[PDB]
Design a protein around this ligand. Structure first.
Ligand SMILES: NS(=O)(=O)c1ccc(NC(=O)NCCNCc2ccccc2F)cc1
Ligand SMILES: [Zn+2]
Length: 257
């Protein structure tokens, strides 16, 4: 059972998952003086149907908001992609204090949290299960979350957490368009990488937004008040779930701007 504590956490994941030391691991530190602007990168285009929102789940180390993915009602296009990618989930990462919590960093700067909006390649594969291990299978948008003013677009998400306080609880989460959480500008960096926790598949084309979104200190406290234990056990708050940045190993981070 992998986790984020000292015994089962990121520094130990390679014992069970050798790809943790691979050549396309995520997240990374984006050094802006080493990024390569690419004129072939098209703008990011997201078109999400709020009717595809399905369910919110406490998965023990985090929580997930999942989406119906039987058709192309909610898709990501453009950027580095020729294929359409189908939305299936968004979630967050955070840290134990405000000074860190993001997974990606920019010129060494750590933000307080990070939003991940995940999609799978339905042009080429028939299911998330098939796509998840393919090099071109997944596309995740990452948004860095900077501590500051309370973000009202987070409100439905935050209000839902009281119904999924402990591990394994789930509840309907409907009529929600997560493009409302994205920053005003979709200028981005992109690089080939991986899932940021086990099974750590090197299957993700990352889209990291240049512009951050805000989150308040109290909103972050709501994330950290989620419990990793099952109902009835001693409460164990979800204090953090961000992986340290990993070596680029010769990869190039491209810039759309
Ligand atoms: N933080 S993140 O990089 O945005 C991120 C991290 C993890 C996930 N999880 C995920 O994709 N599960 C789907 C796996 N497909 C089913 C499957 C097939 C074969 C073996 C195992 C298995 F579960 C998503 C995004
Ligand atoms: Zn994530």
């Amino acid at each position: 059972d992998w986790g984020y504590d000292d015994k089962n956490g990121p520094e130990q994941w390679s014992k069970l998952y050798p790809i943790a030391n691979g050549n396309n691991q995520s997240p990374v530190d984006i050094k802006t003086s080493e990024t390569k602007h690419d004129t072939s990168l098209k703008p990011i285009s997201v078109s999400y149907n709020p009717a595809t929102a399905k369910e919110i789940i406490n998965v023990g180390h985090s929580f997930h908001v999942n989406f119906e993915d039987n058709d192309n009602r909610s898709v990501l296009k453009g950027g580095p992609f020729s294929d359409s990618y189908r939305l299936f989930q968004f979630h967050f990462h955070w840290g134990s204090t405000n000074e860190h919590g993001s997974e990606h960093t920019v010129d060494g700067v750590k933000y307080s949290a990070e939003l991940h909006v995940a999609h799978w390649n339905s042009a080429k594969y028939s299911s998330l299960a098939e796509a998840a291990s393919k090099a071109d299978g997944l596309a995740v948008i990452g948004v860095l979350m900077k501590v500051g003013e309370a973000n009202p677009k987070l409100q439905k998400v935050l209000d839902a957490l009281q119904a999924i306080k402990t591990k394994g609880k789930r509840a309907p989460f409907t009529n929600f368009d997560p493009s409302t959480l994205l920053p005003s500008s979709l200028d981005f960096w992109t690089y080939p990488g991986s899932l940021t926790h086990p099974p750590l598949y090197e299957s993700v084309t990352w889209i990291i937004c240049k512009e951050s979104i805000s989150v308040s200190s109290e909103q972050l406290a709501q994330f950290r008040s989620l419990l990793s234990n099952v109902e009835g056990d001693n409460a164990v708050p979800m204090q953090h779930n961000n992986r340290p940045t990993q070596p680029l190993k010769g990869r190039t981070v491209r810039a759309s701007f």
